Structures are given as C-alpha cells and as structure tokens.
C-alpha cells in the first residue's frame, strides 16, 4: 500500500486543488514561501505508507531562510539547531545509551527508518508564523492521519502539545499506540517533556512486536 493509492480521491477535491492554487498564485506575485515547492511533500517521499512505524506531529514549517525542507522539526545541514529540536536531543542524550549530541539538525535518517515527520500545515509565508492556517492543509492532514488509522495497525503516535493531542482523537487507541506529553518548546519542556521517555517507549513497542528499533542518532548523508 502506497500513499498514491490511498490519497488518489483526495487529490481530486476542489478544496485541495485550490489550496495548491493559492500557494502557486502567492509564489508568482512575489511572496516568498517555505519550503521550496519541490520539498513540500518530502515526508511522503521518504516514508511510504506501509513503512510507517512512528508518527511525530508538527505544526507548520520554519519561516526563516534555509531552515525548512519538508519534514517536521528537521533543518538543513549548516543551520543552527532550533530550541525544540535541541530539547529533543537532550531527552535522547539521557535516555538512550551511546547517544551523543549530533552537531546538526538534519533528520532524513529518521524518516528513512519509518518515522513520518508530518506537519499539520505544509506551507508558510516568510517571516509570518502560522500564515497559511485555515486554507485547506488541516483538512488534508486530518485525512492523512485518518488513513493511517484505518489502513495500518500498531503504529506509535507521539503527540506533543495540546494542539497535536486534539488531532489524536481520530485515532483508535486499541489498534494503535498513542503517547502524549507537553511540547518540547523551552516554555513547556520542564512540565513533562523531559523524562517522558517517548523515544525509549517507542522502541520497546517495536521490539515486543518483533520489529527493528529506530537508531535515533541522526546521520548526515555522504
């Protein structure tokens, strides 16, 4: 089963086609939009439906130049590690043996292992956070989640923050494994994120089902 097969009908909806249209019209009139158009759907390219093992939900892309590249939380090589990702690394340093702070924030190796890094809103206008909200993306990603719920079994969902947790109501908690915690953001990290053990719990779930664990140590492609 591929994304192509399940999303076939959705790509035909007027609303979805008009979301793409609005973005295209904005790019043409001189508005800078992130990520680049070719990267907008990278999460789907690197992690195929049948390969999904873990889903980590994000909000919208980074709005600074050279940051976002189509994956939630990840930034290109050479870009400073953002606060939330830095906190995620810290959680990894004191919960996983042999893990050491990577020195870059590029997470393609996670996606390649079955970790779907999905943002709920797929585009953003430069320097304007949450500027592409309520345009159609949420409706589309709601459907993506609903499809994983329906066509897969035993997937782990890491829902951080209240906004992401609400989106986790569509998920069948018996067929799938849902884990919740405060957002990794510095404002809330000390109220539950640090010590949530999500990365360990995630691997334990996979191990008991007879699946390979995730090597959370990010690697720069050579």
């Amino acid at each position: 089963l591929t994304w192509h097969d399940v999303l076939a009908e959705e790509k035909q909806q007027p609303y979805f086609l008009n979301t793409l249209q609005t973005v295209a019209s904005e790019r043409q009139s001189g508005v800078t939009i992130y990520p680049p158009q070719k990267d907008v759907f990278n999460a789907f390219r690197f992690t195929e439906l049948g390969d999904v093992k873990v889903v980590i939900l994000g909000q919208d892309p980074y709005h600074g130049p050279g940051q976002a590249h189509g994956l939630a939380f990840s930034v290109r090589p050479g870009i400073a590690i953002p606060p939330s990702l830095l906190n995620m690394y810290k959680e990894l340093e004191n919960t996983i043996p042999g893990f050491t702070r990577p020195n870059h924030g590029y997470l393609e190796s996670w996606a390649r292992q079955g970790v779907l890094l999905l943002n709920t809103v797929l585009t953003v206008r430069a320097g304007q956070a949450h500027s592409h909200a309520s345009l159609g993306w949420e409706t589309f990603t709601d459907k993506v989640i609903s499809l994983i719920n329906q066509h897969r079994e035993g997937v782990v969902f890491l829902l951080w923050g209240s906004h992401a947790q609400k989106k986790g109501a569509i998920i069948d908690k018996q067929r799938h494994h849902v884990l919740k915690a405060p957002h990794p953001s510095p404002l809330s990290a000390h109220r539950g994120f640090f010590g949530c053990n999500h990365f360990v719990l995630a691997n334990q779930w996979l191990e008991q089902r007879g699946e390979t664990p995730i090597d959370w140590m990010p690697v720069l492609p050579a």
């Binding site: 709005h63 939330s84 923050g161 809330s188 109220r191």
Partner: peptide
C-alpha cells in the same frame, strides 16, 4: 533571531505563566 514559533492553547500557557490568555498564542523563540 526568531528560530521557531509554536502555537499553544490558553490552558497550556496557564499551567506555566499562571495566567490564562484570551485566545491561542504563538511562542516565538
């Protein structure tokens, strides 16, 4: 330089600031 902006609901913020905002807020960090 603002590196990220995270959306939070009133109750989330309250558990930290001790004050409830009137609407959703963005945490620019």
């Amino acid at each position: 330089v603002i590196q990220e902006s995270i959306l939070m609901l009133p109750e989330e913020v309250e558990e930290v600031i001790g004050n409830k905002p009137e609407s959703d807020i963005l945490v620019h960090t």
